[PDB]
Structure formats: C-alpha cells, structure tokens
C-alpha cells in the first residue's frame, strides 16, 4: 500500500484471494461439478473465471500469432475494472466477453458483439 | 366436553378440548356440541372454523380443502391447508380475494371470514 | 514430473474426501428431517383412510375412479426420481423398476404414458427418447403437499379424460387419457434397505371384509365419496413423495 | 462460397418385466361383506 | 485399412475409442462409480466393460491351469462379434457371459446358462 496506494493493493489482494479460492475449488468442480458448491462459492467461481479471462490481453507483439491488433490499458482503468469485477458488477456478462481484450470499452464492445449489454 | 383435532395434510396443526365447534359445510352452517351424533361433511371452499373453548378466547381458523368428522368423542377437521387468526395477514387476504382464480379467491374469502371482516 | 502430479492428485483426493464426508453428515441430518416429515404426515393419512372407508361402506362403489376400463390400451405412469444426482443407485433403481413396469404393461396390451418427478428421470428418458407428457422438478429433496396435489390433479384429470376415449380417439373430451395410474417410487423400509416399487394409484380395486351407530353423512354419501376420492389420491401421492425424499436422502 | 455452401446445405442429406403380484395395488377398504 | 480392410479397421478403431473413453472415465468411476456419469457415458461404460471381458479368451495353453479346453475364433467372426458389441446388440446380456469364451455361439451358450436369452 505504501508505494502503489491502498486502492491498488486492496484490489490486487482481492483478485489474488478470489483466484486462490478458485484454484482450491477446481478439483471439486471437476469431480462433483459446480452444482454441489455453496451459492457463495458458485458466485466466487463465476467471478474468478471472469477475472482470469480478463487478466489476459491482446498484446502488440502477439498480432503475428492471432491477427488481432494489440491494446494498452492505463493503470487507473485496470484498477477500476478489476475493482468492478471483484464486486460482481460484470457477473451478468458471458466469460467469453472478457477474453483477450483491453479496457472496459473493449469489454462493452465485445459483450455487445456476443449478445449482452455491459 | 369434546376434543377437537385440526389436522393438516403435512402435520397436525391444533388439538385440544373445546365447547362449541362452528363451521360452514356445503349444506349450511353447523354447530357441533359435546354429544353431537356421528357425522361426515365437506366444508365449503371458503369455509371457516370457530372453536369456543372452556375458559379461553375463541379460535378462528381459515380452512382450505376442509372436511368434518364428528364421532361423539372428538371432532376431527381434516384440512388441505389452514391458518390461525393471529397468523393471517389482512393485506394479503384482501389482495388474493376477488381474484379470477377460484381457489385463491376461496382461500382469501376464508381468510377474511376468519379475521372478522367477512 | 511424476511426483508433482502425484502430489496434485493427493491434494485433489483430499479435497474430494472432505467434501464427501461433509455431504454424508448433511445427508444423515436430512434423513432425520425426512423421517420426521413422514411421521408428521401419517395421522392425516390414517384419518382420511378411515373417513373414505366409511363413505365407501355407506355408498355405492361405482365411482368412475374405481372401475377398470374395457379393453384398456393406455396406462399413466408417474416415475418419482431425484433432482440432485449424488445418490448412488437411487435413480438407477427407480428407472429400472419403471422399465420393468413398462415391460409388464406392454405384455398386458397397454401403452405407457409417462410423467416424471425430478430431473434425473427426465434426462434418462430424454436419452431413451421416450416422450414425457409432463414433468415436475425442483422439490424432490423436500416436497410439499401442493406439489402432490398438482401431480394428483393432473393424473386424475388424465384418467377421467380416458373414460370417454374410444380406441385412439379422445372421444367427446378431445383429450386422450389413460386407463390406469401407476406410481414408481422408492420405499424407505429402513435406513439400510430402500426398495423401488410400482404401485397402481388408480383404479382402486375394492377390498372387502365381513364386519368390524352408523354415520350421518351430509349432503349425500355419494357426493362426499366423489369429492374425497381425489383427495385420497393426492394424499397417497404426497406420501409417496415424502417416502421418495427420505429414500433419496 | 457462402451462397454455394447454403445451396449444398439445402441439398445435403444428414444421417425384464414386473411380476403382477409384485405390483401392489391401492385398495378401498370396506366394512361390508362382498356382494 | 489398406491391409486389414475397412471393416476390420473400423471395428478395431471403435473398440479402441470405447476402451479409451472408459479409461478416461476411470478416475470419476473410482470415487463415485458409474452413477454420476451421463447417459451416453453410462451406456459407453457398460459397453466397454463387456468389450474388455470379451477380449479375453479361453486359451489352448490355459487348459493346464483351468482344465477348460481353449477355443479358436475365425477373424471374420471376431470382426462381426465386436461390431455387434460396439453397436450395442449385447448390452442386455450379463457381463460374465463375455468372460473366457470363444465366438458368438459360446456367448449365446454362456448367456443362456446365466439366464439371459441369446
């Protein structure tokens, strides 16, 4: 918190906590399925899948491999977007909408292309 | 005296001694006294039961799917559903009364009669 | 990297063990609850049985719900299964019993018209491509009397609509009904023993005995009999649902 | 190519028994004797 | 296919696919059994168990250990039998009927002995 500030540190720690819990629950989901998780754990699993997809990004150097031009996200936008994600504000969007995009504008455009409204 | 047993399908609701059991069967209003003859009757759709007990306030019960069985040793009212006067809420009963659905209208009218508004 | 994957598998197995043990204890508690609900439901069943028996004793036993159709060709069958699937052989045993009932009915020159309670049976019959007229789901774990009332209403309505049917024609009703109503569910005989059984809800063959102040019925014994028989069918369906829930737990 | 694929798709052709005694029946009890 | 023919190769590939799917499902089956599997997977698992039992055979050299004389199965009969098994024409027979036998005649005899009809 001293260097990056309280907001950045808190958002990063929340993201790490959610991803750690999802990693813990992956085996249970694989064997018994998601339907046997508590409602809060189902919510966390959905949030974690969206977060892990959103951590991916189309890179400038990756175009040669995908044909998609790269993107850059400012730090403030990243912190705000992951704060929103950790609160479940994008839980209604499909997880595929979060895959290989930039900021929240890219998320909205891709969600619209996939039939959902951000 | 006569023992009254208000029994629902899922559970036995009420059981105890009484002094006068008023209800409204299909034929008409009937009042059971301690040594009434054996009888089997069908309570009306919006029926209501009034139990006058010894040294206690009367008990008003809204009854749905009612049936009455007097055996000269205990009065047994078998109900698909029932609601005591205290538990009944006025506003919901008013809302569900005068509804096109016959079943809900009958239930609402029974609740109104049990409350006292008729 | 064999050791690393082995350690990962050990962690996964430990987590699965913890979850399964917790689910087992929760299932023990739920068995207690289901047995309590069955006990709570017992007295109303007893009283309604006695009342219906008296009404039959003081009335003509010629209700259309008590007479076997002529050259019957259809039979309604309600298969009661679970919604959640972590029961071991519950659904498999129930569906095996249902298939045996179908074989018996087909050997008896009938056609099964299928109704389903629960999702596992829905999936089974969807795979088999057997048609399901209606399905009720989402209450197998803890069924209420309203669900049983709805199921019994639908089944009895189909049975009555089957009275006027002639051959494959629906008759004056316009609805092609059935000539029988069977229930295939699991009995909770004891904590150790659960048995899937097929039971004919309708038509109800009359059981007679010699003997045991006559009752004074109003308005008429026949009217009360007609208004009570569907109630008895609903009560039996509710008892079957409660026993199925206990057996599933 | 899209039109040709649509036309081709239009033209394309795709690909024991229960014991009667074991069946316990629901019975209506009656005090009176049989007829 | 260029050497053993199209029918032999296709039947062998189908058998291998069923057995591989069963091997994959082994992990789930060990903990929860076949009951949590999908209907397709349950059917495939029963088929695979019967196939794996039918790949066994009473060998000529095994008579010394069991006293049971061995059997010879013509290649055409093998192909036909395993094609039928993969199709699902013997799913009703009990598993043990497929154990340590020769061709389809032996399967019929053993199934009849165990009760099943063929």
Curated annotation (Swiss-Prot), chains A, E:
Function: Produces ATP from ADP in the presence of a proton gradient across the membrane. The catalytic sites are hosted primarily by the beta subunits.
Homology family: Belongs to the ATPase alpha/beta chains family.
Subunit annotation: F-type ATPases have 2 components, CF(1) - the catalytic core - and CF(0) - the membrane proton channel. CF(1) has five subunits: alpha(3), beta(3), gamma(1), delta(1), epsilon(1). CF(0) has three main subunits: a(1), b(2) and c(9-12). The alpha and beta chains form an alternating ring which encloses part of the gamma chain. CF(1) is attached to CF(0) by a central stalk formed by the gamma and epsilon chains, while a peripheral stalk is formed by the delta and b chains.
Top-level taxon of origin: Bacteria
Shown residues in whole-protein numbering: 358 to 475 of 475
Subcellular locations according to the entry: Cell membrane
Disulfide-linked positions: none
Organism of derivation: Mycolicibacterium smegmatis (strain ATCC 700084 / mc(2)155) (Mycobacterium smegmatis)
Protein name: ATP synthase subunit beta
Swiss-Prot record, chain B:
Subcellular location: Cell membrane
CDD domains: F1-ATPase_delta
Gene Ontology cellular component annotations, sorted alphabetically: plasma membrane; proton-transporting ATP synthase complex
Cross-referenced Pfam families: ATP-synt_DE_N (PF02823)
Topology in the lipid bilayer: Peripheral membrane protein
Annotated GO MF terms: ATP binding; proton-transporting ATP synthase activity, rotational mechanism
Keyword flag Kinase: no
InterPro entries the record matches: ATP_synth_F1_dsu/esu, ATP_synth_F1_dsu/esu_N, ATPsynth_dsu/esu_N
Cleaved signal peptide residues: none
Keywords, sorted A to Z: ATP synthesis, Cell membrane, CF(1), Hydrogen ion transport, Ion transport, Membrane, Transport
Lineage: superkingdom: Bacteria
Function comment: Produces ATP from ADP in the presence of a proton gradient across the membrane.
Family: Belongs to the ATPase epsilon chain family.
NCBIfam families documented for this protein: ATP_synt_epsi (TIGR01216), PRK13442.1 (NF009977)
Subunit structure: F-type ATPases have 2 components, CF(1) - the catalytic core - and CF(0) - the membrane proton channel. CF(1) has five subunits: alpha(3), beta(3), gamma(1), delta(1), epsilon(1). CF(0) has three main subunits: a, b and c.
Protein's UniProt name: ATP synthase epsilon chain
Organism: Mycolicibacterium smegmatis (strain ATCC 700084 / mc(2)155) (Mycobacterium smegmatis)
UniProtKB/Swiss-Prot annotation, chain C:
Signal peptide: none
One annotated Gene Ontology cellular component of this protein: proton-transporting ATP synthase complex
Protein's membrane topology: Peripheral membrane protein
GO biological process entries: proton motive force-driven plasma membrane ATP synthesis
Superkingdom of the organism of origin: Bacteria
Statement: the UniProt record of this protein carries the keyword DNA damage: no
GO molecular function, a single term: proton-transporting ATP synthase activity, rotational mechanism
Keywords: ATP synthesis, Cell membrane, CF(1), Hydrogen ion transport, Ion transport, Membrane, Transport
Localization per record: Cell membrane
Major site of localization recorded for this protein: membrane
Entry similarity comment: Belongs to the ATPase gamma chain family.
Oligomeric and partner information: F-type ATPases have 2 components, CF(1) - the catalytic core - and CF(0) - the membrane proton channel. CF(1) has five subunits: alpha(3), beta(3), gamma(1), delta(1), epsilon(1). CF(0) has three main subunits: a, b and c.
Described purpose of this protein according to its UniProt entry: Produces ATP from ADP in the presence of a proton gradient across the membrane. The gamma chain is believed to be important in regulating ATPase activity and the flow of protons through the CF(0) complex.
Full protein name: ATP synthase gamma chain
The organism of origin for this protein: Mycolicibacterium smegmatis (strain ATCC 700084 / mc(2)155) (Mycobacterium smegmatis)
Range within the parent protein: 3 to 256 of 307
From Swiss-Prot, chain D:
Highest taxon, organism lineage: Bacteria
Cellular location(s): Cell membrane
Family indicated by similarity: Belongs to the ATPase alpha/beta chains family.
Subunit structure: F-type ATPases have 2 components, CF(1) - the catalytic core - and CF(0) - the membrane proton channel. CF(1) has five subunits: alpha(3), beta(3), gamma(1), delta(1), epsilon(1). CF(0) has three main subunits: a(1), b(2) and c(9-12). The alpha and beta chains form an alternating ring which encloses part of the gamma chain. CF(1) is attached to CF(0) by a central stalk formed by the gamma and epsilon chains, while a peripheral stalk is formed by the delta and b chains.
Function: Produces ATP from ADP in the presence of a proton gradient across the membrane. The alpha chain is a regulatory subunit.
Protein name: ATP synthase subunit alpha
Residues of the full protein shown: 500 to 545 of 548
